[PDB]
Design a protein around this ligand. Structure first.
Ligand code: 9JI
Length: 292
């Protein structure tokens, strides 16, 4: 074996990302968990030497096991190897010298798309405030980012509206690459997002390009239901797993177009080989928007 796939996590950390820790001033906490948190912060001199810049900083608590500490470094290396993309919460810098590792990423002023839809749900119109054309753009942008991930042999493993952020110009970005993996055939694997997971992920812990496509289909349902929870009225229990295995699927949300719901049904196919690729999803949605 003289040819091998270059493992992004095995590559050395590039010190081009290194940013002085004392030049960050922390603000409100954006997200919190048992392992760590993400805070809004001000970076002085990050892009321009004399200009302060609003950023988000992902950090672990000192009471963190070594597996979580290297998971944060692995996410940092994935984001650097992946490269910049418009539909990704892009890496801006890192603070690895001595102190606790800090990962500086883009700040999205509007927050997660799930909470955004629930705010705008009361004042939504299909045609003339959130509109239908916004929903089509959001599904198109997230598909491009996922297609970009899949084009780098990478899976996200936690695709959902809560992990899609909105920023200026109605640009959506995929965030939280903590569970992102480089598949090169599939990846086999904590609390899991069962209602977004493909059946093969629930039953055999297998994660693929196709399992991301399943989660994308669940995301489209979140999108066109104006932020409702998936499988409403069904708790994650023994009956839930049985109905999924047998072929139960959510019906079309109220505002979903027929060709958008058609994508959801192909995303939710029991056979992964019959699920569409993200590249196919982009062209389908792209044709839709021009015809719109
Ligand atoms: C008006 N408004 C604006 C925002 C907003 C919110 C973000 C954001 N996210 C915040 C939420 N996220 C996130 N991710 C991972 C975790 C953890 C708990 N699992 C974690 C944390 C650290 C760690 F070391 C390991 C795990 C928590 N929270 C994703 C990023 N990023 C950028 N801008 N932004 C802007 C929210 N309201």
């Amino acid at each position: 074996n003289n040819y091998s796939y270059i493992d992004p996590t095995q590559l050395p950390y590039d010190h081009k990302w290194e940013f002085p820790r004392n030049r960050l001033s922390f603000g409100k906490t954006l997200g919190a968990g048992a392992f760590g948190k993400v805070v809004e912060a001000t970076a002085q001199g990050l892009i321009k030497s004399d200009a302060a810049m609003t950023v988000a900083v992902k950090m672990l608590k000192p009471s963190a096991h070594s597996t979580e500490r290297e998971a944060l470094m692995s996410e940092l290396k994935v984001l650097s190897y992946l490269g910049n993309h418009e539909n990704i919460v892009n890496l801006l810098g890192a603070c690895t010298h001595g102190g606790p590792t800090l990962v500086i990423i883009e700040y999205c002023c509007y927050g997660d798309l799930l909470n955004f839809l629930r705010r705008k749900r009361d004042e939504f119109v299909p045609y003339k405030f959130l509109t239908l054309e916004h929903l089509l753009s959001f599904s198109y942008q997230v598909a491009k980012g996922m297609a970009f991930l899949a084009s780098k042999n990478c899976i996200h493993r936690d695709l959902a509206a809560r992990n899609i952020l909105l920023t200026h110009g109605n640009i959506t970005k995929i965030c939280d690459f903590g569970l992102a993996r480089d598949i090169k055939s599939n990846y086999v694997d904590a609390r899991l997002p069962v209602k977004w997971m493909a059946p093969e992920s629930i039953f055999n812990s297998v994660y693929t390009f196709e399992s991301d496509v399943w989660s994308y289909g669940i995301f489209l349902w979140e999108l066109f239901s104006l932020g409702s929870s998936p499988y409403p009225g069904m708790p994650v229990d023994s009956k839930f797993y049985k109905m999924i295995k047998e072929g139960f699927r959510m019906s079309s949300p109220e505002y979903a177009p027929a060709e958008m719901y058609d994508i959801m049904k192909t995303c939710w196919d029991a056979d992964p080989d019959k699920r569409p690729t993200f590249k196919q999803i982009v062209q389908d949605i792209e044709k839709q928007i021009s015809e719109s």
